[PDB]
Design a protein around this ligand. Structure first.
Ligand SMILES: C=CC1=C(C)/C(=C/c2[nH]c(/C=C3N=C(/C=C4\NC(=O)C(C)=C4C=C)C(C)=C\3CCC(=O)O)c(CCC(=O)O)c2C)NC1=O
Ligand SMILES: [Cl-]
Ligand SMILES: [Cl-]
Ligand SMILES: [Cl-]
Length: 242
Protein backbone atom coordinates (compact mmCIF):
# COMPACT_ATOMS: atom_id res chain seq x y z
CA UNK A 1 0.00 0.00 0.00
CA UNK A 2 0.95 3.70 0.11
CA UNK A 3 2.78 3.61 3.46
CA UNK A 4 5.73 2.18 1.46
CA UNK A 5 6.84 0.71 4.80
CA UNK A 6 6.62 -2.82 3.36
CA UNK A 7 8.45 -1.94 0.13
CA UNK A 8 11.49 -4.16 -0.37
CA UNK A 9 13.01 -1.72 -2.91
CA UNK A 10 12.47 1.56 -1.07
CA UNK A 11 15.28 1.17 1.47
CA UNK A 12 17.83 0.63 -1.33
CA UNK A 13 16.74 3.38 -3.75
CA UNK A 14 18.41 6.67 -4.53
CA UNK A 15 17.51 9.34 -1.90
CA UNK A 16 15.73 11.64 -4.36
CA UNK A 17 13.64 8.71 -5.60
CA UNK A 18 12.76 7.85 -2.00
CA UNK A 19 11.62 11.38 -1.29
CA UNK A 20 9.56 11.60 -4.45
CA UNK A 21 7.94 8.20 -3.80
CA UNK A 22 7.01 9.43 -0.33
CA UNK A 23 5.65 12.71 -1.65
CA UNK A 24 3.52 11.01 -4.29
CA UNK A 25 2.20 8.45 -1.79
CA UNK A 26 1.45 11.24 0.70
CA UNK A 27 -0.46 13.21 -1.92
CA UNK A 28 -2.62 10.18 -2.71
CA UNK A 29 -3.05 8.73 0.78
CA UNK A 30 -6.23 10.55 1.83
CA UNK A 31 -8.00 10.48 -1.55
CA UNK A 32 -11.11 8.37 -2.25
CA UNK A 33 -8.86 5.52 -3.45
CA UNK A 34 -9.73 2.06 -4.59
CA UNK A 35 -7.24 -0.56 -5.82
CA UNK A 36 -6.71 -0.72 -9.54
CA UNK A 37 -5.94 -4.28 -10.64
CA UNK A 38 -3.18 -4.31 -13.27
CA UNK A 39 -3.13 -7.08 -15.88
CA UNK A 40 -2.54 -10.42 -14.13
CA UNK A 41 -2.95 -8.49 -10.86
CA UNK A 42 0.69 -7.69 -11.13
CA UNK A 43 2.42 -6.34 -8.02
CA UNK A 44 5.99 -7.45 -7.66
CA UNK A 45 8.03 -8.96 -10.51
CA UNK A 46 11.63 -9.89 -11.22
CA UNK A 47 13.34 -11.08 -14.39
CA UNK A 48 16.76 -11.77 -15.79
CA UNK A 49 18.10 -13.05 -19.11
CA UNK A 50 21.85 -12.91 -19.91
CA UNK A 51 22.66 -9.83 -17.74
CA UNK A 52 21.42 -8.01 -14.63
CA UNK A 53 18.11 -8.66 -12.94
CA UNK A 54 15.29 -6.17 -13.07
CA UNK A 55 12.94 -5.90 -10.06
CA UNK A 56 9.71 -3.88 -10.21
CA UNK A 57 7.20 -3.02 -7.51
CA UNK A 58 3.86 -1.79 -8.83
CA UNK A 59 1.22 0.19 -6.80
CA UNK A 60 -1.94 1.24 -8.68
CA UNK A 61 -5.14 2.94 -7.55
CA UNK A 62 -8.16 4.74 -8.94
CA UNK A 63 -10.52 7.51 -7.89
CA UNK A 64 -13.55 9.08 -9.61
CA UNK A 65 -11.29 11.72 -11.18
CA UNK A 66 -8.27 9.49 -11.93
CA UNK A 67 -8.96 6.31 -13.88
CA UNK A 68 -5.55 4.90 -13.00
CA UNK A 69 -2.83 6.13 -10.63
CA UNK A 70 0.41 4.20 -11.04
CA UNK A 71 3.55 4.36 -8.96
CA UNK A 72 6.29 1.98 -10.08
CA UNK A 73 9.67 1.54 -8.42
CA UNK A 74 12.35 -0.48 -10.18
CA UNK A 75 15.96 -1.48 -9.86
CA UNK A 76 18.35 -3.11 -12.31
CA UNK A 77 21.08 -4.93 -10.47
CA UNK A 78 22.73 -2.63 -7.95
CA UNK A 79 23.39 0.10 -10.57
CA UNK A 80 20.10 1.57 -11.70
CA UNK A 81 17.06 2.90 -9.85
CA UNK A 82 13.84 4.08 -11.46
CA UNK A 83 10.64 5.78 -10.35
CA UNK A 84 7.71 5.92 -12.75
CA UNK A 85 4.44 7.65 -11.98
CA UNK A 86 1.41 8.54 -14.05
CA UNK A 87 -2.02 9.74 -12.98
CA UNK A 88 -4.31 8.93 -15.87
CA UNK A 89 -7.33 11.20 -15.73
CA UNK A 90 -10.95 10.16 -16.16
CA UNK A 91 -11.68 11.98 -19.47
CA UNK A 92 -15.08 13.23 -18.21
CA UNK A 93 -13.30 15.74 -15.96
CA UNK A 94 -10.85 17.10 -18.55
CA UNK A 95 -7.80 16.99 -16.26
CA UNK A 96 -4.25 16.82 -17.65
CA UNK A 97 -1.90 13.89 -17.16
CA UNK A 98 0.50 14.07 -14.22
CA UNK A 99 3.67 12.14 -14.93
CA UNK A 100 7.17 11.78 -13.70
CA UNK A 101 10.15 9.61 -14.35
CA UNK A 102 13.39 9.52 -12.34
CA UNK A 103 16.44 7.46 -13.26
CA UNK A 104 19.51 7.21 -11.02
CA UNK A 105 22.83 5.40 -10.99
CA UNK A 106 25.84 5.37 -8.66
CA UNK A 107 26.90 8.81 -9.93
CA UNK A 108 23.52 10.26 -8.88
CA UNK A 109 20.27 11.04 -10.62
CA UNK A 110 20.76 11.04 -14.41
CA UNK A 111 17.24 12.00 -15.48
CA UNK A 112 14.40 13.74 -13.68
CA UNK A 113 11.26 14.43 -15.68
CA UNK A 114 7.92 15.77 -14.43
CA UNK A 115 4.92 17.29 -16.17
CA UNK A 116 1.25 18.06 -16.25
CA UNK A 117 0.64 17.07 -19.87
CA UNK A 118 -2.24 18.30 -22.03
CA UNK A 119 -5.21 16.32 -23.22
CA UNK A 120 -7.03 19.13 -25.13
CA UNK A 121 -6.89 19.11 -28.93
CA UNK A 122 -5.31 22.59 -28.83
CA UNK A 123 -2.42 21.07 -26.80
CA UNK A 124 -2.95 23.63 -24.02
CA UNK A 125 -3.47 22.99 -20.34
CA UNK A 126 -6.77 24.23 -18.91
CA UNK A 127 -6.82 27.91 -18.01
CA UNK A 128 -6.75 27.33 -14.24
CA UNK A 129 -3.62 25.19 -14.57
CA UNK A 130 -1.92 27.81 -16.71
CA UNK A 131 -2.65 30.44 -14.08
CA UNK A 132 -1.47 28.38 -11.11
CA UNK A 133 1.66 27.12 -12.89
CA UNK A 134 2.67 30.60 -14.10
CA UNK A 135 2.53 31.76 -10.45
CA UNK A 136 5.26 29.28 -9.47
CA UNK A 137 7.77 31.12 -11.66
CA UNK A 138 10.49 29.59 -13.82
CA UNK A 139 12.72 27.26 -11.80
CA UNK A 140 16.48 27.46 -12.32
CA UNK A 141 18.30 24.27 -13.26
CA UNK A 142 21.90 24.11 -14.46
CA UNK A 143 21.62 20.99 -16.64
CA UNK A 144 18.44 20.98 -18.69
CA UNK A 145 17.91 18.19 -21.19
CA UNK A 146 16.04 18.43 -24.49
CA UNK A 147 13.08 16.09 -24.91
CA UNK A 148 13.16 13.47 -27.65
CA UNK A 149 10.74 13.91 -30.59
CA UNK A 150 8.00 11.71 -29.07
CA UNK A 151 8.10 14.16 -26.17
CA UNK A 152 6.05 16.67 -28.09
CA UNK A 153 3.24 15.35 -25.81
CA UNK A 154 4.67 17.25 -22.80
CA UNK A 155 3.57 20.74 -21.82
CA UNK A 156 5.70 23.88 -21.83
CA UNK A 157 6.00 23.43 -18.04
CA UNK A 158 7.73 20.03 -18.39
CA UNK A 159 10.92 19.57 -16.36
CA UNK A 160 13.68 17.39 -17.84
CA UNK A 161 17.01 17.79 -16.05
CA UNK A 162 20.06 16.11 -14.66
CA UNK A 163 20.10 17.51 -11.09
CA UNK A 164 23.49 19.15 -10.42
CA UNK A 165 23.48 18.95 -6.62
CA UNK A 166 21.24 18.37 -3.60
CA UNK A 167 19.76 21.87 -3.82
CA UNK A 168 18.51 21.08 -7.32
CA UNK A 169 17.24 17.64 -6.28
CA UNK A 170 15.19 19.25 -3.54
CA UNK A 171 14.00 22.05 -5.84
CA UNK A 172 12.79 19.46 -8.34
CA UNK A 173 10.94 17.45 -5.69
CA UNK A 174 9.31 20.63 -4.39
CA UNK A 175 8.14 21.53 -7.89
CA UNK A 176 6.61 18.05 -8.26
CA UNK A 177 4.86 18.61 -4.91
CA UNK A 178 3.59 21.94 -6.29
CA UNK A 179 2.30 20.25 -9.43
CA UNK A 180 0.49 17.65 -7.32
CA UNK A 181 -1.09 20.28 -5.10
CA UNK A 182 -2.41 22.16 -8.11
CA UNK A 183 -3.59 18.95 -9.74
CA UNK A 184 -5.39 17.54 -6.73
CA UNK A 185 -7.10 20.88 -6.11
CA UNK A 186 -8.21 21.22 -9.73
CA UNK A 187 -9.61 17.69 -9.47
CA UNK A 188 -12.08 18.92 -6.83
CA UNK A 189 -13.22 22.06 -8.79
CA UNK A 190 -13.25 20.58 -12.33
CA UNK A 191 -16.58 20.86 -14.16
CA UNK A 192 -17.88 17.53 -15.68
CA UNK A 193 -17.74 17.90 -19.45
CA UNK A 194 -19.92 17.36 -22.50
CA UNK A 195 -19.78 14.09 -24.45
CA UNK A 196 -17.82 15.88 -27.24
CA UNK A 197 -15.36 17.37 -24.79
CA UNK A 198 -14.98 14.00 -23.02
CA UNK A 199 -14.17 12.45 -26.36
CA UNK A 200 -11.56 15.16 -27.09
CA UNK A 201 -9.82 14.44 -23.74
CA UNK A 202 -9.95 10.70 -24.30
CA UNK A 203 -8.20 11.22 -27.68
CA UNK A 204 -5.49 13.26 -25.97
CA UNK A 205 -4.84 10.55 -23.43
CA UNK A 206 -4.68 7.86 -26.11
CA UNK A 207 -2.14 9.92 -28.06
CA UNK A 208 -0.06 10.39 -24.89
CA UNK A 209 0.08 6.63 -24.32
CA UNK A 210 0.94 5.88 -27.92
CA UNK A 211 3.80 8.40 -27.90
CA UNK A 212 5.16 7.17 -24.54
CA UNK A 213 5.43 3.71 -26.08
CA UNK A 214 8.04 5.13 -28.50
CA UNK A 215 10.55 5.50 -25.64
CA UNK A 216 13.31 3.03 -26.36
CA UNK A 217 15.08 3.90 -23.07
CA UNK A 218 12.33 2.14 -21.14
CA UNK A 219 11.96 -0.59 -23.74
CA UNK A 220 15.64 -1.55 -23.72
CA UNK A 221 15.76 -1.89 -19.93
CA UNK A 222 12.67 -4.15 -20.02
CA UNK A 223 13.99 -6.15 -22.98
CA UNK A 224 17.37 -6.85 -21.40
CA UNK A 225 15.67 -8.47 -18.40
CA UNK A 226 12.52 -10.05 -19.93
CA UNK A 227 12.77 -9.97 -23.75
CA UNK A 228 10.91 -8.28 -26.56
CA UNK A 229 7.46 -9.85 -26.20
CA UNK A 230 7.31 -9.28 -22.45
CA UNK A 231 8.47 -5.65 -22.86
CA UNK A 232 5.85 -4.97 -25.55
CA UNK A 233 3.09 -6.42 -23.36
CA UNK A 234 4.32 -4.47 -20.33
CA UNK A 235 4.56 -1.12 -22.12
CA UNK A 236 1.28 -1.46 -24.00
CA UNK A 237 -0.85 -3.17 -21.29
CA UNK A 238 0.68 -2.22 -17.93
CA UNK A 239 2.39 1.16 -18.30
CA UNK A 240 0.62 2.98 -21.15
CA UNK A 241 -2.63 1.23 -21.77
CA UNK A 242 -4.72 2.73 -24.57
C1 LIG B 1 8.50 1.73 -15.59
C2 LIG B 1 9.72 1.45 -16.12
C3 LIG B 1 10.61 2.52 -16.57
C4 LIG B 1 12.01 2.25 -17.09
C5 LIG B 1 12.70 0.98 -17.28
C6 LIG B 1 12.51 3.59 -17.40
C7 LIG B 1 13.77 3.78 -17.88
C8 LIG B 1 14.41 5.00 -18.41
N1 LIG B 1 13.71 6.17 -18.73
C9 LIG B 1 14.68 7.02 -19.22
C10 LIG B 1 14.45 8.35 -19.80
C11 LIG B 1 13.28 9.09 -20.02
N2 LIG B 1 12.05 8.92 -19.42
C12 LIG B 1 11.19 9.96 -19.90
C13 LIG B 1 9.83 10.26 -19.53
C14 LIG B 1 8.94 9.42 -18.94
N3 LIG B 1 9.00 8.07 -18.80
C15 LIG B 1 7.88 7.62 -18.15
O1 LIG B 1 7.63 6.42 -17.93
C16 LIG B 1 6.97 8.72 -17.82
C17 LIG B 1 5.68 8.66 -17.13
C18 LIG B 1 7.69 9.94 -18.37
C19 LIG B 1 7.32 11.32 -18.29
C20 LIG B 1 6.31 11.78 -17.52
C21 LIG B 1 11.98 10.79 -20.84
C22 LIG B 1 11.52 11.96 -21.58
C23 LIG B 1 13.28 10.21 -20.87
C24 LIG B 1 14.38 10.66 -21.76
C25 LIG B 1 14.41 9.83 -23.01
C26 LIG B 1 15.59 9.99 -23.89
O2 LIG B 1 16.59 10.58 -23.42
O3 LIG B 1 15.54 9.54 -25.05
C27 LIG B 1 15.92 6.39 -19.19
C28 LIG B 1 17.22 7.04 -19.59
C29 LIG B 1 17.78 7.96 -18.51
C30 LIG B 1 18.83 8.93 -18.92
O4 LIG B 1 18.98 9.21 -20.13
O5 LIG B 1 19.52 9.51 -18.03
C31 LIG B 1 15.75 5.15 -18.69
C32 LIG B 1 16.80 4.10 -18.44
N4 LIG B 1 11.59 4.55 -17.12
C33 LIG B 1 10.47 3.97 -16.62
O6 LIG B 1 9.45 4.61 -16.26
CL1 LIG C 1 11.14 9.84 -31.09
CL1 LIG D 1 17.89 3.45 -26.97
CL1 LIG E 1 24.43 -2.19 -21.86
Amino acid sequence: DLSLTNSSLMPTLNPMIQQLALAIAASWQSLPLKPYQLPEDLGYVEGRLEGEKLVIENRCYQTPQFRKMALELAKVGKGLDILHCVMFPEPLYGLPLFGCDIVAGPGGVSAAIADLSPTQSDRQLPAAYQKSLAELGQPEFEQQRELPPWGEIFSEYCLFIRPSNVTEEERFVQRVVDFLQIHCHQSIVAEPLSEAQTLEHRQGQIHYCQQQQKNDKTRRVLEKAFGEAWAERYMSQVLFDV
